[PDB]
Amino acid sequence: MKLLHIDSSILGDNSASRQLSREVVEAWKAADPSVEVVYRDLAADAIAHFSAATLVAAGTPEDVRDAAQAFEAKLSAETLEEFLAADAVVIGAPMYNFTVPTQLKAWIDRVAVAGKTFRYTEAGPQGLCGNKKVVLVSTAGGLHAGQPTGAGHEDFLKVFLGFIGITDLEIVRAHGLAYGPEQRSQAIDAAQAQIASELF
Amino acid sequence: MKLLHIDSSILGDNSASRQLSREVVEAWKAADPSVEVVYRDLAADAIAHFSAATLVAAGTPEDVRDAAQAFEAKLSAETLEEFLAADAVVIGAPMYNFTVPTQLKAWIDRVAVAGKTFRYTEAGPQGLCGNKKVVLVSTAGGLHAGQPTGAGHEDFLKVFLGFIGITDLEIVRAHGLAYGPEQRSQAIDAAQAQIASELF
Numbered sequence: 001m002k003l004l005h006i007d008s009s010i011l012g013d014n015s016a017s018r019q020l021s022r023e024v025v026e027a028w029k030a031a032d033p034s035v036e037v038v039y040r041d042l043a044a045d046a047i048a049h050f051s052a053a054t055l056v057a058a059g060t061p062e063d064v065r066d067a068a069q070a071f072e073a074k075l076s077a078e079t080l081e082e083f084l085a086a087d088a089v090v091i092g093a094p095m096y097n098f099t100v101p102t103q104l105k106a107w108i109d110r111v112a113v114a115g116k117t118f119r120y121t122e123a124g125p126q127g128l129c130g131n132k133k134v135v136l137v138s139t140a141g142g143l144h145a146g147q148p149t150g151a152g153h154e155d156f157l158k159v160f161l162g163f164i165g166i167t168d169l170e171i172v173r174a175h176g177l178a179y180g181p182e183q184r185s186q187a188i189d190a191a192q193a194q195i196a197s198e199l200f
Numbered sequence: 201m202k203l204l205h206i207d208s209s210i211l212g213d214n215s216a217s218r219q220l221s222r223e224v225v226e227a228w229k230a231a232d233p234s235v236e237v238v239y240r241d242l243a244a245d246a247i248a249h250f251s252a253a254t255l256v257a258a259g260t261p262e263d264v265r266d267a268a269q270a271f272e273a274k275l276s277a278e279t280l281e282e283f284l285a286a287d288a289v290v291i292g293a294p295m296y297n298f299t300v301p302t303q304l305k306a307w308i309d310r311v312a313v314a315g316k317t318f319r320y321t322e323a324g325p326q327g328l329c330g331n332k333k334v335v336l337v338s339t340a341g342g343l344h345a346g347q348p349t350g351a352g353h354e355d356f357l358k359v360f361l362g363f364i365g366i367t368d369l370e371i372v373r374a375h376g377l378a379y380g381p382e383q384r385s386q387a388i389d390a391a392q393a394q395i396a397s398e399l400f
C-alpha cells in the first residue's frame with residue numbers, strides 16, 4: 001500500500017499536528033510493515049497559490065508553454081499524481097484563523113480535479129476516491145468542534161473529502177491546546193490512545 | 201471615509217465577484233462622493249503564505265532582519281495598516297473548492313493580529329473592529345448557502361469577521377452561477393437589485 005503523509009503546520013518542532021501525524025504513520029508502519037510512505041511537507045515546500053496562471057497553463061499545450069507555465073503544469077501534475085497513487089493519506093491539519101493553513105488548501109486545489117478525483121455527470125458530481133483511507137490529524141488551540149466557530153476547519157475538510165468520495169475517514173483530534181500545559185498534554189495523550197488502540 | 205476594495209477572484213474579466221464588488225464600490229461612491237477608495241487585488245498581487253518565516257520575521261528586531269525577513273515584516277505591516285485605516289471594506293469572495301481562495305485567506309492571516317484587530321483578555325477574546333462596515337460579495341457555482349457544503353465559505357467568513365468584531369455586515373450573494381446562463385444572469389440581476397435598493 002502507498003501511504004501519503006502530509007504536514008501543513010508552520011510550527012516545526014513545536015507542532016502538535018506534525019507530532020501526531022508522524023505518530024499515526026509510525027503506528028501504521030508497525031501494523032503493516034509493507035507500507036510504502038511518501039512524505040510531503042506543505043509548509044516547508046509550499047505550493048503556489050492556485051492562480052489565473054495555473055489555469056492558463058493547464059489550457060496551454062506543453063510545446064507552447066513558457067517556463068512559468070511549465071512550472072505550474074508540473075506542479076499540478078506531480079501533486080495530483082502523488083495523490084492518485086496513494087492508497088492512504090495522513091493529513092496534518094492545524095486550525096489557523098478559523099480554517100486550515102493556506103499551505104493545505106493550496107494542495108486541495110491541486111488535487112480537486114474533474115475527471116480525476118471527482119467527475120461531473122448528467123446526474124451530478126461524483127467522487128472517485130472511495131478506495132482511499134484518510135486519517136485527518138486535527139489540531140486547534142480552542143475547543144470548537146461541533147460549533148459554528150469550527151466551520152472552516154473540520155466541517156470544511158469533511159465537505160471536501162466527501163466530495164471527492166472519501167468514505168473511510170478517521171479523525172485524530174487534539175484541541176484546546178492553547179488552554180494551558182495540562183490541557184494540551186491531556187489532549188495529546190487522548191489522541192495517542194486513539195492511535196494506539198482505535199486506529200489499527 | 202476610507203473604503204478598502206478587495207478582490208480575490210482568479211477569473212479576471214469573467215469574474216462574478218469582481219463585477220459585483222466594483223458595482224458595490226461604484227454605488228458607494230455615488231451615495232458618498234467623499235469616500236476615498238483603496239484597491240487591493242489579492243489575486244494579481246498575491247500575499248505570501250503565512251509561514252514559519254513570517255513568524256520568525258515578526259520576532260526579529262528590524263535592525264537584525266535579513267532581506268527576506270524585511271519583506272515578510274513589511275508585507276505584514278502594510279496589509280494590517282491598510283485594514284486598520286479602512287472604515288469600510290468590500291470583499292470579493294469566490295468559492296473555490298468549498299472555501300475562499302487561498303489569496304483571500306492569506307490576507308485574513310495578515311489582518312488577524314492580537315492587540316490590533318482583536319485582543320485576548322482575562323475574560324476571553326474580543327474583536328476590535330466594530331466600527332468597520334463590511335460588504336461581502338459572495339459568489340459560487342452551486343447553491344449551497346445554509347447547507348453543510350457551505351461551511352468553508354460564508355460560514356467561515358462570518359466566523360472570522362465576527363471574531364474581529366465586525367457587527368455591520370451585508371452579504372451580496374450571486375450563487376448557482378454554474379447552472380447555466382439564465383440562472384447565472386438572474387443571480388447577478390438579483391445581486392444588482394440588492395446593491396441598488398437595499399444597500400444605501
Ligand SMILES: Cc1cc2nc3c(=O)[nH]c(=O)nc-3n(C[C@H](O)[C@H](O)[C@H](O)COP(=O)(O)O)c2cc1C
Pocket residue numbers: 009010011014015016017018093094095096097098099139140141142143177178
Ligand atoms: C497563525 C495562527 C493562527 C491560529 N488561529 C487559531 C484559530 O483561529 N483558532 C484556534 O482554535 N486556534 C488557532 N491557533 C492555534 C493552533 O490551532 C494550535 O497552535 C494548533 O496546535 C496548531 O497546530 P500545529 O501545532 O500542528 O501547528 C492558531 C495558531 C497560529 C500560529
Ligand SMILES: Cc1cc2nc3c(=O)[nH]c(=O)nc-3n(C[C@H](O)[C@H](O)[C@H](O)COP(=O)(O)O)c2cc1C
Pocket residue numbers: 209210211214215216217218293294295296297298299339340341342343377378
Ligand atoms: C478553481 C475553482 C474551484 C471552484 N470550486 C467551487 C466549489 O467548490 N463550489 C462551487 O459551488 N463553485 C466552485 N467554483 C465555481 C465558482 O464559485 C464560480 O465560478 C464563482 O463565480 C467564482 O467567483 P468568481 O467568478 O468571482 O471567480 C469553482 C471555480 C473555480 C475556478
Ligand SMILES: O=C1c2ccccc2C(=O)c2cc(S(=O)(=O)O)ccc21
Pocket residue numbers: 097140141142143144149178325
Ligand atoms: O488566533 C489565535 C491563536 C494564535 C496563535 C496561537 C494560539 C491561538 C489560539 O489559540 C486561538 C484560539 C481562538 S478561540 O476561537 O478558541 O478562542 C481564536 C484565535 C486563536
Ligand SMILES: O=C1c2ccccc2C(=O)c2cc(S(=O)(=O)O)ccc21
Pocket residue numbers: 125297340341342343344349378
Ligand atoms: O469544482 C467546481 C467547479 C470548478 C470550475 C468551475 C465551476 C465549478 C462548480 O460550479 C462547482 C460546483 C460544485 S457543487 O458543490 O455546487 O456541486 C462543486 C465543485 C465545483
